[PDB]
Amino acid sequence: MISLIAALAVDRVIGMENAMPWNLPADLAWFKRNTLDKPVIMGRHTWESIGRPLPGRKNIILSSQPGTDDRVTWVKSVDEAIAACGDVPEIMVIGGGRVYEQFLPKAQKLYLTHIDAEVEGDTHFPDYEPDDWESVFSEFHDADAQNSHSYCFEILERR
Amino acid sequence: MISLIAALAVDRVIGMENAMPWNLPADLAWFKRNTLDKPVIMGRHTWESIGRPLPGRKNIILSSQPGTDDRVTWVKSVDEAIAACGDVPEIMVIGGGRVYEQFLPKAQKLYLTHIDAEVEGDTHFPDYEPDDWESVFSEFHDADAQNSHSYCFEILERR
Ligand SMILES: Nc1nc(=O)c2nc(CNc3ccc(C(=O)N[C@@H](CCC(=O)O)C(=O)O)cc3)cnc2[nH]1
Ligand SMILES: Nc1nc(=O)c2nc(CNc3ccc(C(=O)N[C@@H](CCC(=O)O)C(=O)O)cc3)cnc2[nH]1
Numbered sequence A, B: 001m002i003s004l005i006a007a008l009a010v011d012r013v014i015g016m017e018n019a020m021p022w023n024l025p026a027d028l029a030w031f032k033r034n035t036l037d038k039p040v041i042m043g044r045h046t047w048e049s050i051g052r053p054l055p056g057r058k059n060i061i062l063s064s065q066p067g068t069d070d071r072v073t074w075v076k077s078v079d080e081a082i083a084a085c086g087d088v089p090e091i092m093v094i095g096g097g098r099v100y101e102q103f104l105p106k107a108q109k110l111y112l113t114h115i116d117a118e119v120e121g122d123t124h125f126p127d128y129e130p131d132d133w134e135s136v137f138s139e140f141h142d143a144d145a146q147n148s149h150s151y152c153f154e155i156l157e158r159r
Helices: A025-035 A044-050 A078-083 A097-106 B025-035 B044-050 B078-085 B097-103
Strands: A002-008 A013-015 A039-043 A058-062 A073-075 A091-093 A107-115 A133-141 A151-158 B002-008 B013-015 B039-043 B058-062 B073-075 B091-093 B109-115 B133-141 B151-158
Touching: A002 A013, A002 A025, A002 A097, A013 A097, A025 A107, A025 A151, A039 A044, A039 A097, A044 A058, A058 A078, A073 A078, A078 A097, A091 A097, A097 A107, B002 B013, B002 B025, B002 B097, B013 B097, B025 B109, B025 B151, B039 B044, B039 B078, B039 B097, B044 B058, B058 B078, B073 B078, B091 B097
Parallel strands: A002 A091, A002 A107, A039 A058, A039 A091, A058 A073, B002 B091, B002 B109, B039 B058, B039 B091, B058 B073
Antiparallel strands: A107 A151, A133 A151, B109 B151, B133 B151
16 A cells, blocks of 8 residues: 655745754654665656655655666556565655655545645645545644744554 | 853843744754853753763763753852853853853853844843944855755854
């Protein structure tokens, strides 16, 4: 099963030119815990930004480009992407945008981080129809000494 | 010779209850670079924000309470602290708020990082009579893929 995971700001903003202005270790931590030991699919840019494969996980890159790093697996198609995940219980899509778009329709579960932040982004998580999904988990947290903003943990299952 | 280093948001904001909303890897670099191979004087909470002893530097913590970590050197005054530095060309003072207050008077130089952001502050960089200093270096930068905000670095010497 495919699952998407993402951090979202107000308006479903997920990306921009510049570095996101916020400090969410707790989020990083959530992400971690939810991806660890699972295959992860991501696009080129994401891969770039990250700059090293994520330890503990089968890193799969979705590009058209040929890719240098042999530490990961590159693929050119959604089908391939999936193919490369083998026999697993959950496949985790980590974006970006188009990636999310592509996988959304195959996606059965979503892990979303809702951040109380307002920014001018260039990228947005694809709109999804609420009526189609069920919140089976949600967990609010205020900003604290380590998290610059308040944010909330949500997991939706496809209805 | 004494110097102070700090990064100030608008209005001398240097701290908040919660996490600063910005991510400035470049300022840290600047910080590292200007503090390396010199004694760094800090106050207890910074030290606790830092969590470990800064490599390449000699860590002096000014406080009322008694040590907790054999690694660094604890002092109770500004004279001791200054003492603990020994004969060295420049002593770097690093915060927080109180500390900087107590050293401001003896400083001959300021290493400032003016951050482009409005935040409701809890601590502030000591006020300093701009007439009393000469800017001797300044360097602007724009926010980018790695730094959420724009900032300018500056060095001021006591006139
Ligand atoms: N919820 C969510 N939060 C995110 O930050 C996020 N980021 C991406 C893509 N960007 C990144 C960037 C960095 C790392 C990363 O460094 N991950 C480390 C966490 C390291 C830590 O705890 O410092 C990992 O080992 O998973 C992952 C994804 C995708 N989905 C997200 N989804
Ligand atoms: N310009 C400036 N920026 C700061 O962030 C700052 N911080 C303090 C006290 N706060 C801190 C907290 C953590 C680290 C720290 O990890 N420093 C590393 C750099 C690490 C890196 O390159 O990630 C060091 O080794 O110097 C430093 C200062 C004092 N003056 C400052 N001054």
